[PDB]
Design a binder for this molecule. Structure first.
Ligand SMILES: Nc1ncnc2c1ncn2[C@@H]1O[C@H](COP(=O)(O)O)[C@@H](O)[C@H]1O
Length: 165
């Protein structure tokens, strides 16, 4: 039982909240799709994006640079399915809105709808770090959209406590 390794709370038959590292959660599930909380240029310099890139030994960034050079930058709310690099079956790069730039927070709906294409998704709370969206607000957008099995992973115990009462 992969989740026995982690404190967690089942919210619905779709959505479970997990305390830990989303990369280590996804490693337990060979058929999971791991969500990267990315920016429009897929520049994975810090945050969960930097951690995912480091776990891939830089391979994620090389793949992202090829994609962006070929396709041009993404829009806020866009998502792109790329290779998993042995971290997960695939990695879904999702561009959440940046509240610092007063971008439309409701674009999180579009971000989370994109996860419904996959039978099992491991995701952080998109935009919930430096992009300035409060975790409970990002969770609100997630639970409204999720139609598949989603493990929502938070690496702060204070965030986990606040989300589980
Ligand atoms: N490995 C991780 N696993 C789960 N959550 C993370 C991880 N790294 C960062 N976070 C949090 O997930 C949210 C989105 O990450 P970020 O896009 O980097 O702001 C923020 O609340 C981060 O603090």
């Amino acid at each position: 039982m992969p989740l026995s390794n982690f404190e967690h709370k089942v919210i619905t038959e779709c959505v479970t909240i997990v305390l830990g590292d989303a990369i280590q959660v996804a490693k337990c599930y060979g058929e999971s799709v791991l969500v990267n909380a990315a920016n429009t240029h897929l520049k994975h310099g810090g945050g969960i994006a930097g951690a995912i890139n480091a776990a891939s030994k830089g391979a994620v960034q090389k793949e992202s640079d090829e994609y962006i050079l070929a396709k041009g930058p993404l829009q806020v709310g866009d998502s792109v399915l790329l290779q998993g690099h042995s971290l997960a079956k695939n990695i879904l790069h999702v561009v959440g809105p940046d509240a610092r730039a007063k971008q439309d927070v409701s674009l999180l709906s579009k971000c989370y709808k994109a996860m419904n294409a996959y039978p099992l998704v491991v995701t952080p709370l998109v935009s919930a770090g430096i992009f300035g969206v409060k975790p409970a607000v990002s969770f609100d957008y997630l639970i409204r959209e999720a139609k598949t099995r989603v493990l929502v992973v938070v690496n702060s115990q204070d965030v986990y406590k606040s989300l589980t009462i």
